[PDB]
Structure formats: C-alpha cells, structure tokens
Curated annotation (Swiss-Prot), chain B:
It is found in: Secreted, Extracellular space; Cell membrane. It comes from Homo sapiens (Human). Binds 1 copper ion per subunit. Optimum pH is 7.2. N-glycosylated. The gene is AOC1. This is Diamine oxidase [copper-containing]. Disulfide bonds join C151-C155, C355-C381. The active site is at D337 (proton acceptor), Y425 (schiff-base intermediate with substrate). Inhibited by amiloride and amiloride analogs. Inhibited by isoniazid, cimetidine, clonidine, berenil and pentamidine.
Amino acid sequence: RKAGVFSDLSNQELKAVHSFLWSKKELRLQPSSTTTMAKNTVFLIEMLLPKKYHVLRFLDKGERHPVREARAVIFFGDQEHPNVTEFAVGPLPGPCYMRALSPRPGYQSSWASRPISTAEYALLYHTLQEATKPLHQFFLNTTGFSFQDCHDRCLAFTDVAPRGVASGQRRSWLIIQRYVEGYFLHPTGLELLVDHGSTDAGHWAVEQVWYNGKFYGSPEELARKYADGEVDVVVLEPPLFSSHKPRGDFPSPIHVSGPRLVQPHGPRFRLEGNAVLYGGWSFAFRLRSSSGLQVLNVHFGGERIAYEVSVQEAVALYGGHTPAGMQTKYLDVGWGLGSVTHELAPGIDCPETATFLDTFHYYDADDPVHYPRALCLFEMPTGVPLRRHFNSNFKGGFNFYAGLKGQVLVLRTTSTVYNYDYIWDFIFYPNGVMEAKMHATGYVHATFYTPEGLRHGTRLHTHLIGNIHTHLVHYRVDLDVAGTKNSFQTLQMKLENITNPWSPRHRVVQPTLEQTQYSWERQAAFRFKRKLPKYLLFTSPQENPWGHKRSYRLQIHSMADQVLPPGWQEEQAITWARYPLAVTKYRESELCSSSIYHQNDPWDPPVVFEQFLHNNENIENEDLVAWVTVGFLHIPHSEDIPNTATPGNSVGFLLRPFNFFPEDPSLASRDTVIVWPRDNGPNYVQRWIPEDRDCSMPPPFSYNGTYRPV
Amino acid sequence: PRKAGVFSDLSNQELKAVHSFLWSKKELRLQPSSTTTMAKNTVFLIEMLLPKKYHVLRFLDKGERHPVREARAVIFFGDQEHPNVTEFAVGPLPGPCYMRALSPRPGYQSSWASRPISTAEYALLYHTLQEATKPLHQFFLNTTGFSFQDCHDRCLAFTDVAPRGVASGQRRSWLIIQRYVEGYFLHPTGLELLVDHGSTDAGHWAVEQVWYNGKFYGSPEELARKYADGEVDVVVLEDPLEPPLFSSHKPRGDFPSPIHVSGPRLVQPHGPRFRLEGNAVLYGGWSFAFRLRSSSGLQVLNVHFGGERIAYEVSVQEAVALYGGHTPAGMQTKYLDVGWGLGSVTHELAPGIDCPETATFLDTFHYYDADDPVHYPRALCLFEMPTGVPLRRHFNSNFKGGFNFYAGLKGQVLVLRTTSTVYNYDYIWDFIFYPNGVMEAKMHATGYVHATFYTPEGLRHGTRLHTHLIGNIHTHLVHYRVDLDVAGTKNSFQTLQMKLENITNPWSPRHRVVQPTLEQTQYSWERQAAFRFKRKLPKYLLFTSPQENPWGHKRSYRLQIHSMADQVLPPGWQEEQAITWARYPLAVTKYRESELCSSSIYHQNDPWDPPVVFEQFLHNNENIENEDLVAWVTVGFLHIPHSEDIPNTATPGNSVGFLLRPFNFFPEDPSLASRDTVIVWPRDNGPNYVQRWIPEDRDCSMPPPFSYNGTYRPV
Ligand SMILES: *[C@@H]1O[C@H](CO)[C@@H](O[C@@H]2O[C@H](CO)[C@@H](O[C@@H]3O[C@H](CO)[C@@H](O)[C@H](O)[C@@H]3O)[C@H](O)[C@H]2NC(C)=O)[C@H](O)[C@H]1NC(C)=O
Ligand SMILES: *[C@@H]1O[C@H](CO)[C@@H](O[C@@H]2O[C@H](CO)[C@@H](O)[C@H](O)[C@H]2NC(C)=O)[C@H](O)[C@H]1NC(C)=O
Ligand SMILES: *[C@@H]1O[C@H](CO)[C@@H](O[C@@H]2O[C@H](CO)[C@@H](O)[C@H](O)[C@H]2NC(C)=O)[C@H](O)[C@H]1NC(C)=O
Ligand SMILES: *[C@@H]1O[C@H](CO)[C@@H](O[C@@H]2O[C@H](CO)[C@@H](O)[C@H](O)[C@H]2NC(C)=O)[C@H](O)[C@H]1NC(C)=O
Ligand SMILES: *[C@@H]1O[C@H](CO)[C@@H](O[C@@H]2O[C@H](CO)[C@@H](O)[C@H](O)[C@H]2NC(C)=O)[C@H](O)[C@H]1NC(C)=O
Ligand SMILES: *[C@@H]1O[C@H](CO)[C@@H](O[C@@H]2O[C@H](CO)[C@@H](O)[C@H](O)[C@H]2NC(C)=O)[C@H](O)[C@H]1NC(C)=O
Ligand SMILES: [Ca+2]
Ligand SMILES: [Ca+2]
Ligand SMILES: [Ca+2]
Ligand SMILES: [Ca+2]
Ligand SMILES: [Cu+2]
Ligand SMILES: [Cu+2]
C-alpha cells in the first residue's frame, strides 16, 4: 500500500519514538503521571505528514517513499523558564534525530498556552480539597456532599477555558458539581477561580469565589458569611433526570427490537491497512491524535478529487450569568480532539455489520494507549434510491421501471472530550458524491440556575441552566480536481427581460446562467454577511466530452453565523469562523487552521487564519485549498435532558461532481434493476446480479470500556 | 383508528358511487374521459373533500358526531356554447343525494382555457400534428429517420410545455419534437411547434409558428419549401436504433474495484413496530392519520406525540420548475405540478429499491382523467429504517483508562413515502418521524431532466449534456402547508436570536466581557411573520402554546428549513401571480376555511389570473397572537444541469424540506420512554454488566421475492 505514507503511527512506532527520546538523559524526561508540573515530559507523539511535493512524486511519478517522521511535543517544566517545544523525530523505522520545529521569536506565553493534563487535574483537586476546608459544613448543609471523607457523596468540578483575561495567564473558573450519574448536570451554585500558573502547586490559590449570584473573595469569607446568616443559600426510585435509564410510557409501547442490517455476503469495500476501495472510490485515511479524522488521496474512477479532507477545529462559544459561563470558549483541539475516540458500541454507534478498527494514541499518557473500536467503516442502505424512473405509457401501463437501490459507505469516528460526544462521518455515495458530517450528542455545558441566567440560556431542571452557545467546526478541503492545478468559479441565475421572439408585443422575463471567475484570494473569502453563491465550483482546465470544464461542487449544510466581533480579543483564535468558505493557495506553512495551543492562549495563538489571506495571492490555475466553516446556534431546551440528540443536530458539506464525468458515474453499478413489459406474459425483470434474500447473524454484542497500553 | 377515517381518501366503492350519482343526472349529458372530442361534458376528477376543521375537531376532541363525508367533483362542461369548468361537492357518503356548488368563481371568464390537459386532448393534438406536418414528412425522414405519419417503431413524439400563451384565456402550446426511443425525453430533434388548441372543435386547431435549429419559419409549408430549396442549415441525426443508448439506465463502464454481491439489506424478523390500520398510524409516541389527495399529494393529519396534538395538517401544496431557454419552448416553461394531478401519478413502488423490502406497501385508487376509478398498486409505503446514527450516545470516561458507563440508543425512523411521476421527473415525498418527537418533510428529485435541442445560444440558459442536448437552467420550488396546532389550536409565533452584550468583567473590572445573550422577538401581525428571501431568517422559528413546561418555559415546536431556494421571478410580474407563495421561505397566516390551499389544478394554465393568490392571504395583516396559525414553507433549489444528470438526476444532495422539533414542549427528552436504550456498566474484577430493557436480537427472516406489475387499471 502506498496509502501507508498517510498512516498513523503503530504501537511499535510510538514505542520507538518514546524509547528514543527517553534514551536522551539530558532531556530529564519523567512520566505524564508524575504529580508535579516542574518536570519534563513528552505530551504527544503523532505521525508528521511529509511535504505534499514529495508525497505526490511518490504517488504519481514513481519516486521514493518520503521519510516517515513523528511530531513529538515536549513540555519542558523542569527548567528556570518553562516552555513547550516541538520536534520532528525520525526516521521511522530506526529514529536518529530530533529536530526542533516552529520557533516564535518574542512570544513569551508558551508554558501558559499548553493543554491541561491528568497530573495537573490531580493537583487542582488537591488544591480544592485543602482550600475549601473552611466550607466543609456549608457543603454538607447545602448539598449533602463534600470533598472530605465523601465516598459516594463527593463534589467534583468542571473547568472552563480560556483561563484568564490575557496571554500568559492560567487562572481557571471551576464549576462545582455533585459527582453522580451524569454529574455534568448537577451544579451546586459555587464557582471558584484558581490561579495555577506556577510550576509549584503549593503557590496555587483560590483568588475568587462566586456563590448563587454573589462574589465572596475567599472560601474563608463565604464560610464566615454563611455562619453569620449573610448568605442566600440554596439547599439542593425513578432514575435521576441526568440518567439515560428509561422512564415514562409511550401511548403505543414498543417491546421488540427494530429492523437491523444484515450483510451475509460480506463487505463490498476492500480495506487494507488505511487504504479503502469501494466501487469507483479509492482513498486513504488517518486519525490525527491532535485534530481528528482525515481522508486523503481521494480518487473516483482512478482520478484524484481531493488530496486532503480533514477536521481542523471544533468550538463551542458560550454566554452566561455566572463567571464560568461567561468565560467559556471551548476549542477541542486544545483537548486532543483526535485522541478521545472512545469505543464504538456495535449495533448502536455503528451497525452490527460494521468493520470496527482499533487505533493507538500517545496523548498525555505514560505509554502508547490502545483504543478499541476507535473507528468503524460500513456500507448502509440510505432508504432512498440513488435514481429511479417510472416510464409510463400514459394508457394504464409502462415502457419500463428502472431503479438503483441507495447505498453509502461511511467512515466514522467520535470525539468525547468530556460532556459532549461528536460523531464524525465521511460518507461516499456510488455516484462520486462525498459528504462530511458531524452530529452532536452527549451532555450540554450547564451552570447553576438563578433568574439572571434566563438572559443567557434556558432553565432545564430545578437548579440547572443550559447556557446559550454556538457550535463552529472548521474543515480543510484540499481539493485537487483531476490534479493539482485548479481554478475557482461560481454560477448564479440572473433574469433577462427580452422581447418575446414569437409575439413581439410581449416580453419574456426568464433565467439565464451567469458565471463569475475569481483571480485573487480575497475575492473568494466569503463572509457571513455576503450572499453565498448557489454553485461553488473548483475547476480543472480539462473539459468533458461536451465542452464543459471538469469540476467538483461544494455544497454547505450549516446554520452558522458570525459570533464574536472580528478583531476583538479571543476572536483572534478563530478568525476562520469569519468565513463559511475561504480559498487559499496551498502552502506548507498553512496546513492547519488551529493548534493544541489555541484553547489556552486565544489572544496570541501560533496560527491566525486571517493572515493566510494577507498576501492576497493569485488563485488562477494554482493548487487551491478550500476551508469550510459549519455550525449552529444551540439554545438549550428541556428535550436536551439528559442528552442532546442527533436528529436535526448535524452540519457538514457535500462534494458533488459537476461536468467531471461524461455521464452519471454510478452507471457502472451492476445493482441496477430494470423491469420491462412483455406481450401476453409476465414482465422481464432485468438484473446484472442475482436477487438475494439471505439472512445471517452478526457477532453477539460486547463492549469493553477500557483503553490501556499493550 | 376508526376516527382517522374522517381524513381518509375515497374507496373504489365510494368513487364508483359518486360517479354513478353524477351519471344518473341525464341533464349533465356526461360522456367518458376517453371520448376524442373536446366538445363534451365529462367528470375530470373525484376526490374526498375534507370537512370543516371546526366540525372535525368537535368529532375528534369533544365526542360529537362524525361530520358528513363528501367528494369533490370537477366537471368539464365542454358541450355548450360557452364552455367552462365547474366543481361540486357530492354527498353524503354513503348514499349520495346532492351536488352543491364548490369553489365558485363568478365573473371569471377563462375557466375553460385554465383546465388541465387530458389524454383525449393529447390524442387530438397528435392527429393535428400528423395532418399539419405532412409537408415536412420528407424533411423528417431525411433529418431524423423518424416520422409522424405511417410510423411503427420510428415514431416522432412531442413534449408540451406550459403555460400556454401570453395571457389569461389562451391555450397555445409550444411542443418540443422528439424521437420516441428509450428515454425519449433526451432526444429533441431541433424542431418546436406552436399549436393553438383553444377551440372545442379540433378541426380549427393550427400550427401557428415553427421553430427549427435557431430560426422561426411561420408554417410547416414554409420550412418544407426552404428545406427543399436548400436554404436550411439542417442537423442530420444519427440512427439511435450493442452499447446502451445514453438515455438508458442499462449499466456500462466498470468500477476499478469490482462489486459482485448484493449490498447489506434490512431484515425485520419481529415485524413492524408501528401499528398501521386503515389510514391511522401509531409509532411509539406518535399518532397520525394520512391521505393522498389526488390533486395535490401526500398529507399527514391530526399529528400527536405523547397524546398531545402538534399539527392538524402537514401537506404538499405545489411543486414548480421554472425554466429559462434559448428555444421558444424552453423560455416558455414554468411547470406547476398540481395542474397535472401531482397526487395522482403515484406509480408503483419497487420493493427493495423505492422502499426497503421490509416496508409495508399500500395500494390506492384515483379518479383523475379516467373512465372509471383506477387501481394504483404500491402507491405508498410505510417503513421503519435504521438511520445509521444513534439518537443519543455518551461515553462517560473516568479519564484514567476506563469508564463509568456507556449509554446509547440505536437510531431508527418511521418513513411514510409516496412518489409523483407526472412525465420526466420522479419526486419522492417523505414524511419522517423520529422517536424523540422530531418530524421531517423531505422531497428528493430523480428521473429525467427537461431538455431542449442544442445550439450555441443555449449555453446562456443551460449546459450541453450530449451531442444535440441542452439541460435548461431552472429552479425547483415546493410549497408546504404546515397547520401546527401546538398543544391545541391557539398559538403564537416568536423567534430567538443571539445578541452580544459588552459589559464590565464582574471579577476583573479593568476588563470587558463581550458575550452572547438570548434575545426573544414576539410577532403580533401576519406581515411581521412573512419572511422574504432578502430578509434575515431567524435561527429559531417557534410556534408556541401559552402552556408552560415544568421549568417555566412556553411549550413550543420549532421549524427548521433545509433549502437553497431564493426569489426567482419578479414580484408582481405576469405569471409570478401564480406563485406568490414563493416570495416567502416562511409565512404565517390566520386559519380560514377559504384559504386551505396555496395553489390549484387551474394555476398551471392560467398563471396570470389564478383562483388563489397566496399574497392575498397577507393583505388583511391579521392579528396572530393566540390564534389558530398556519405556517407555510417554501423549499427548493437552483438546478443547473450537468453531464452527471444523464440519463437521470440522482438523489444524493438533491433533497429539500424541513424539520419540526419540540422546544420546551416536553419536560425532558421524550425518547426516554424507549426501551431500546442500552447502558453498559463496569464491574470490579469482572465483565461489564450490559443493562437492557429489550433482549438482544439476532433473529432472521426473509422478504418475499421481488415482483413488479407496472399496470394501473380499474377493478
Ligand atoms: C358553466 O356551465 C354550467 C353548465 O352548463 C352552467 O350551469 C348551468 O346554468 C344553466 C343556466 O344557463 C342552467 O340551465 C337552466 O336554465 C333554465 C332557464 O332557461 C332554468 O329554468 C333551468 O332550471 C336551468 O337552470 C343549468 O341548470 C346549470 N347547470 C348546472 C349543472 O348547474 C353554469 O352556469 C356555467 N357557469 C358560468 C359561470 O357561466
Ligand atoms: C525551551 O526549552 C528548551 C529545552 O530546555 C530550550 O532548548 C534548548 O536550547 C538550548 C540553548 O539553545 C540548547 O543548548 C539545547 O540543545 C536545547 N535543548 C533541546 C532539548 O532542544 C529552548 O531554548 C527553549 N525555547 C525557547 C524559545 O526559549
Ligand atoms: C421588462 O421590460 C419591459 C420593456 O421595457 C417593461 O415594460 C415597460 O414597462 C413600463 C412601465 O410599466 C411601461 O410604461 C412600458 O410601456 C413597458 N414597455 C413595454 C415594451 O412593454 C417591463 O416592466 C419589464 N418587466 C420587468 C419585470 O422588468
Ligand atoms: C477488556 O479487554 C482486555 C483485553 O482483551 C481484557 O483483558 C483480558 O482479559 C482476558 C479474559 O480474562 C484475560 O485472559 C487477559 O489476561 C486480559 N488481557 C489483557 C491484555 O489484559 C479485559 O478483561 C476486558 N475488560 C472487560 C470489562 O471486558
Ligand atoms: C466594549 O466596550 C468597551 C468599553 O466601551 C470598549 O472599550 C473601549 O474601546 C475604546 C477604543 O474604541 C478605548 O479608547 C477605550 O479606552 C475602551 N474602554 C474600556 C473601558 O476598555 C470596547 O472596544 C468594546 N468592545 C467591543 C467588541 O464592542
Ligand atoms: C398485474 O396485475 C394484474 C392483477 O393482479 C394481473 O392480472 C391477473 O393475471 C393473472 C395471471 O397471473 C390472472 O390469473 C388474472 O385473471 C389477472 N387478473 C386481472 C384482474 O386481470 C396481471 O397479470 C399483472 N401483470 C403483470 C405483467 O405482472
Ligand atoms: Ca495566501
Ligand atoms: Ca488543492
Ligand atoms: Ca390573513
Ligand atoms: Ca394551527
Ligand atoms: Cu450545543
Ligand atoms: Cu431539476
């Protein structure tokens, strides 16, 4: 497989990179699990893609496999001036070198920008246990739970990000919750601000306390005001409301299992490593531990359509009445969006007939970690024919019926960082259409109910506000339509008003086809304020047999809009969210629109998408990259309890051939059925594959739930 | 289930009873539809006429008597000095006694010209062409190899466009001439003919204009002469009669990765989980009735979830395709499907292809341009199908190599489906019901595009798809009536937006917080809630009840539109009067019995002066606070054809519609009553506990062998 150039690191490869780094005594490496911040540790290891120039010479011109390398992110906490530095480690197999990457002269906030880690959370929990001792009685009286000798009645916390008011700060608002089933939905009314910037956790402090609508300065002050009767206190078997356990009764109860897919004849796609073949399609895939799912080197009918289609970032931007709520701008890549690909449940998350695939991740771990059923690949009937026609004779019969049953191939993973579960799909139809989709489910981000909260959300239970927010997702769509050099054009309908040529006293007011060409990047950077043309076309100079340029069309499915003001503070981290569509000239320095650092330094991040447009380059006959923002406003509602559900809660885009193929490319499918009438007999049912009614059983259900080194 | 009968379409027996009652009135001078003269009186359409909502609701909700059941009957009165179309309500059913005036339009003088085309009329048009084009017979043989006269397997055919003239009262049709081969829609010859067929005496009908390959010629004789004299730039077409014809669905080409076996299929060993009886459906939380109105299409009625009404009616109202063209037929074409019996062209669904092999397939009867009620096999289907994505799921990690639980609910949806194949295009009409109280309307487009003869000038109005073929640019627009009755009749309409505030940071006063807030807008008057395409459409469109949920929020349903539609024709210009609803992705009206439909069978052939002008429902700008509201939704898409549309447009990416989602209506997720949920829990030192409320299924079953009939006939 040539697709191996795109493949993630194996367990063996991750171990080899880790071993190589640990052989360097001068790095003073310690495990992720060690509970001090004043340590040097390897935070993330993942495959580092070679330059596209070299990859295409290997794929297309028969040249050598590019050098395979890893990206290694090292937290240097065990030095006077802590920082994060990244390295290219290679070659693989047999690593030799360690080359530092991406310097930022003059940038001083590297350390503060780094992701939170399990060890850091352990230290935060200790800080809280100690700092809140004065509140122990308050906790018991108001919630029946505590942090001390609490057992099955313990308080927990949820941190929000970003963590302060400026670059270099690490001051986190923490929402206190009761640790019960679906704890996300059990805020107590207390929130605490902790400064945890120092590498010495003994310096960490609670700097501010908010309880039920008022600030109190310190845990001691709240405790004293409580004792003195100066606090407006809220004192907090069917299933818990936050449980998924069934309750209630439908008027027409259902006691049996629903229909299921059977695949007695096995998969109709071929999977070899990370290479997939399905009908006209060939592609490779990878799951980038930092940023998520990608499909690469996508071909249909042996011609390239897209070099890369990848998840880049996923954001949830909140308002609130509470300090934690008004603070929250979550950026998932800052949490290992591609590393939280937890186990897919057969028959539920994917069909029982799906092919389930494991992966390995090294993200905030002591050793590479095995993730069972991290991805699945499956063919599914869509329930609607790809095409059908009833050719009537308009006299009580027919000339023929023709139809092709609808099927699609789905490549799927998930991300569950904490409360939310996103389902990430790349979908391939037999006629050369591909679709990207993200569906949201899991638990909402929620805060304690007070009346003031109703200006920033919806009351969802007695003590619970679902905060208003917008979800925004960015994708990189490096279309290479029939090859690398493309142009971008749009089509519109425009009316003309002409003399009616067969009745000159009258007029014809009718549609015409208008084509718009784009020469410079800025012309193709569409803001949310701008009218998005209905046909967004990436074109090859090659023509089809009818004289029309071979193209692929991008069709966006989104309810997104401009959320933050352009140029204001944290908006610097998400300037891509100004554009439902922007088109750039391909550059190796612009492969990603976000980073793991954006979450915790959104004020001065290492990648600012807007800057990609500053040079306003020529985009006529160039290697073009489309970048797509999709999303939706989510005002929570009571039906979101216990979880948001997927119906209507998906966004994404389609890539559709447009004059690319001389006729419908699904015509090669032998699944087509045509029914023909016959004089004085039964109809002739014409098939190119025999009718099948076989049934088989899938494997019995199992689920593991653990993800451990191997 | 008996009560759903108030909404039910007429039976074969009821249609026969209505027809017989009319035929018993000898003064009507009725003749069969098939009689080949226009100068006749005939019953063109018979369908159930829904009773007044006031009476239906008293029946359903207050225990009062079943309303009287009636049929709409449309009579073409062609056998008189001043022909017209008149409608009647015939009842009661059973035992029809009366025919009362229905939808009278006194003072309107063009009803005859406005009427739909019929099979008899097409036969007379063919006879007119056979005679009128005699001068062109040799021209036809030389340029096409096909003919109108003395043909058997090499016959010319035509496709008529509409509307038919330049003003109300005209019936002058442009006809695209084609070769009658497999997929004939895609074989234009380059000739188009304008025929005036207004007279009830077909002997007066004439070809009044001729267009061939870029030029007008006046008459068939003039073109014949110029051709004979060597003065016509002709296009000689190749013989179309081993490889399949381009317009055929027969496979050709080969995928690089061979597929030699059937793909995965649904099995349903436990049978349906929905309860379908007559036109009544129960599915978990859902209860609804349905009907297939012969004139306008699929409807779902009296839609409830959890025993509470959500919608009185959700129905297809009209489906339009508005074209441009270089040819006179192309530039004429504004097709309105209700003018062709949109709900009557529900042709046979092929099991395993059009619906899953596990679907329930239902027959119907229609009486539309027929001599007797006609049986339509497998006209509808109803099926549950896995969506492939869980309704909800969550992995509750312990962040230390394990979990606290996994919970998930497998995705299923109930689909009620029919189709419409008037001629070239096949639309697939779905109403879909999710177990969490979300319902969705969807239309998918497939079949053959409307196409004209290629010349270079055609490229300003379309795409060259084959040697001699232009796919004309057009826009599809569909109108839906959405009579939401959220928890009952009296509702209001409101919208929600996000608006930023900029405040002092309350914990760091030197700084600012610029953040989202929730903004609510109330609407009091119809005009305020008529959203034009140029207007910003709010992201939350809510229909509210005054009743509050347990958390103090008003019980609502949210409308979410999936569309790429835009304004097509200029508001107020000529034929736009027929489609003024297409100005509005959403408009909200006060319920009225005189405003039940936004279109009619008459709109297609008199778009200039039609019997219903949707804009008129907004003229009185009525108060819409605590009233019976009706939402009306336009969905659609611009379709610039492309070579992948040959032989047929395909469904992927070619659907539009809307969702209705509960919004603070239920106290928590209404799917929680589903016993399909599975939760897996960890156990110390043991295997996990898989908690279920329905046992694991791996049973098997087989569907019946495929069959397909293809005929639709009286029974
Ligand atoms: C559309 O055509 C229908 C059918 O021809 C018209 O209804 C018919 O109207 C005539 C009146 O012209 C009625 O004829 C008879 O007139 C004599 C008077 O000499 C009267 O004594 C009889 O009682 C009878 O009414 C005829 O009954 C009536 N037919 C039906 C089925 O209603 C209709 O008026 C035309 N519509 C328009 C708007 O012109
Ligand atoms: C971040 O910390 C790293 C590691 O301490 C620094 O990298 C070292 O730089 C010194 C001085 O140039 C070299 O002698 C060492 O070889 C480096 N060590 C490694 C492992 O690369 C680095 O200078 C700091 N980065 C910044 C921007 O200050
Ligand atoms: C299309 O163009 C025609 C011709 O310019 C416009 O018709 C004119 O309209 C004005 C104002 O109503 C009249 O006074 C003229 O007599 C009309 N001229 C002719 C030749 O008909 C027409 O309004 C235009 N329509 C649209 C929708 O733009
Ligand atoms: C999850 O998977 C792991 C790995 O397969 C299971 O651990 C194995 O358990 C088997 C059965 O007892 C033992 O024979 C092996 O010693 C274990 N292998 C390893 C590598 O640890 C584990 O039991 C599974 N957990 C659950 C809850 O199903
Ligand atoms: C939010 O409001 C603040 C306060 O009015 C704005 O901050 C001021 O901005 C101007 C520059 O236009 C400065 O001269 C002032 O010194 C600022 N005042 C304070 C108190 O900070 C701020 O620009 C507003 N931001 C947005 C996005 O509207
Ligand atoms: C279409 O359906 C009709 C009605 O079932 C079929 O007509 C019957 O054909 C069978 C022969 O298999 C005869 O026994 C019956 O007498 C026929 N009944 C009627 C009412 O005509 C018809 O054969 C079917 N056509 C096709 C092509 O399958
Ligand atoms: Ca650039
Ligand atoms: Ca490219
Ligand atoms: Ca009104
Ligand atoms: Ca209503
Ligand atoms: Cu959300
Ligand atoms: Cu179309």
